Symmetry: C2
Amino acid sequence: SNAILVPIDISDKEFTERIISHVESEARIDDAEVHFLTVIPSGMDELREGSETQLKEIAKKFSIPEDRMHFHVAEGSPKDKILALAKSLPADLVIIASHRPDITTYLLGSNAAAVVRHAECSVLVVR
Amino acid sequence: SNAILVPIDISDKEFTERIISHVESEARIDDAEVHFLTVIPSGMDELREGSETQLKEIAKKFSIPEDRMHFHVAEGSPKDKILALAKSLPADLVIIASHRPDITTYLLGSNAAAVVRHAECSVLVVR
Ligand SMILES: Nc1ncnc2c1ncn2[C@@H]1O[C@H](COP(=O)(O)OP(=O)(O)OP(=O)(O)O)[C@@H](O)[C@H]1O
Ligand SMILES: Nc1ncnc2c1ncn2[C@@H]1O[C@H](COP(=O)(O)OP(=O)(O)OP(=O)(O)O)[C@@H](O)[C@H]1O
Ligand SMILES: [Mg+2]
Ligand SMILES: [Mg+2]
C-alpha cells in the first residue's frame, strides 16, 4: 500500500500495542506514506496542538522513516473524519484496532465497525 | 504474517481479482504459508475433489511459491468453517473480499462481516 491511514485515539488509557508491528510491516511493503490521524471533541487551537503533540509522541513507538510520517488532527465524529480523510488522501489502506485494549464486551468497537463497512479502500482490523 | 488464511468462494461467477495483489504482498512480508480454503454445501467425495481442483485453478492466478501454497476444502457454513480453520491453523491473518464483485447492495457480505467481527486474529478486508 502507498498511502496508509492510521487512526489513533490518543486518550487510549492503554495504547493498542499490536498495531505497531502491523503498521511497520505494511509500510515496509511499498515504503508507504503513513498518515496518523486523531479525532478530538468539537481554546480549540490549544486542544488541537496538544492533541497533535500526543499523537506524535505515540508515533515515536513506530519504526518508520521520519520522512514518511504525516500527522492529522480533526474534530468531531471519529468514524466520519476517518472516512473523510481516507477518501481525500486517498488512502490505499486503513489500519485500525478492533476495539480499545481494556474493553472486551464488544468484538468490534463502533468506529472499527463503521470504518470496515464504509471505507472505499481495504481495511486491516488488527487484533 | 506467518500463516495467512485466504477463503475463496469458487462459485464466484466473477472472481474477486483485487485480492490477488494483496495476498501476494502480504505473503511476501514474511514468506508466509498461504492457506486457500473453499467451503461447499454439506457423491461428496467427488464434489470435494472437484471443488479442490477449481480452488487450485484459481490459485494459479497468484504469484506465490508453490511450496508455500496449501489447499483446504470444508463443508457447511462458510463463516463457521473459515473461523474454525483460522483458529486451528492458527492463522495470523485472514484476507477476505468485502463482498462478491457483481453485487453492491450490501457494503459487507454476510461472511465478510462475521469473519471480521469474530476472528481471533487480524483480518484484511479487501476492496
Ligand atoms: N477519536 C479517534 N480518533 C482516531 N481514531 C479513533 C478514534 N476513536 C477510535 N479510533 C480508531 O478506531 C479504533 C477502534 O476504536 P473504537 O472506538 O471503534 O473502539 P472502542 O473505543 O472500544 O469502542 P467505542 O468508542 O465504540 O466505545 C481505534 O483503535 C482507532 O484506530
Ligand atoms: N463458500 C465460501 N468459501 C470460502 N470463502 C467464502 C465463501 N463464501 C464467502 N467466502 C469469503 O467471504 C468473502 C465475502 O463473501 P460474502 O459471502 O461475505 O459476500 P457475498 O457473497 O456478496 O454475500 P452473501 O453470501 O452474504 O450474499 C468472499 O470473497 C470469500 O473470501
Ligand atoms: Mg472508541
Ligand atoms: Mg457469499
